[PDB]
């Protein structure tokens, strides 16, 4: 029953409420492969509490796989702690969570991975974000991003 890796994400968001935050450290990235957005919304806050005593690079490596369920405020907070999030992780973030981010905040989030943002300018999260930004603000990234 529970010995299989797909077990965790076979449970509904309602059932996943009872999962104790003290378990989250043993949850491997493999276990979250089959988890929908409604389930990550329930698991992320439990990951937040389970890892909150950690900081920077050590915190990010642990929270990475759960950031799908992270709201805007937590992404803003993450940008301040000079964490260098890779573009593949950023492209899996929920659209609603990314849109309100500023040019400065996205550049701090991605660090040197911002250099690859031109190739994703038409793709799901980044496209939506670009359409809400002033072209003059996009110009400062030095990528030649278009459509503000």
């Amino acid at each position, epitope marked *: 029953t529970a010995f299989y890796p797909g077990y965790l994400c076979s449970l509904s968001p309602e059932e996943l409420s009872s999962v104790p935050p003290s378990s989250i450290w043993a949850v491997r990235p493999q276990d979250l492969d089959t988890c929908d957005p409604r389930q990550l919304d329930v698991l992320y806050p439990k990951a937040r509490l389970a890892f909150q005593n950690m900081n920077g690079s050590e915190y990010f490596v642990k929270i990475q796989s759960f950031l799908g369920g992270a709201p805007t405020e937590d992404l803003k907070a993450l940008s301040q702690q000079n964490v260098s999030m890779d573009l593949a992780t950023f492209m899996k973030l929920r659209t609603d969570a990314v849109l309100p981010l500023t040019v400065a905040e996205v550049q701090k989030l991605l660090g040197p991975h*911002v250099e690859g943002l031109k190739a994703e300018e038409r793709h799901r999260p980044v496209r939506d974000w670009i359409l809400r930004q002033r072209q003059d603000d996009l110009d400062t990234l030095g990528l030649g991003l278009q459509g503000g």
Partner: single-chain antibody
Amino acid sequence: DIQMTQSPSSLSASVGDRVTITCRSSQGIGSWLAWYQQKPEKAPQSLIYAASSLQSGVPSRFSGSGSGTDFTLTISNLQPEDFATYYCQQYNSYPLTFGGGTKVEISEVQLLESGGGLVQPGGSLRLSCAASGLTFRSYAMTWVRQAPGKGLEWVSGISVSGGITYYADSVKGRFTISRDNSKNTLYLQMNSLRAEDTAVYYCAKRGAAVGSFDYWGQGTLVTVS
């Protein structure tokens, strides 16, 4: 200044071999690292940015790994076109710094530098770089130089807008960088030139305001004495 150390310094291999080049930084640089390939008598080319991201056009048999202070460039299935010198570069903080290089023995964009030549000590010279096949207006630019027998040294950089300029300590107060977007031209005004300013001067586009050098010109030779 962050110090970048490469191993081995020299290396002999055959077609098909796996080649492993190490790059070590004196401080943490996170993932702010690039790898460059320089073939004999040619300008450098971008391989890697952000420690592990392949530059467009670069074969998959190149891969970068690591973060913090420990970085690796692995060349799988070494080909004859891989005969070259490989440099790592941190762009975590100014001055931008290169490793001493590793000798391995066995474009939609165009940047044309001009104005190189022989100059008397204490003399003046203005380098030009004509960029084409890109929206020049929208990219940050730098000058990098290579003393005849030596490795790469970052000289100065200019922002997208031209409002912010950066210089290496060895050229601050003597060198001025500027841009004319209407002429698609990057300039380096060089004053009070010394024997140690002798080098091939390369024009380079930055992949981002804070990014690697993704395109290089063929360069222009300046000699002093």
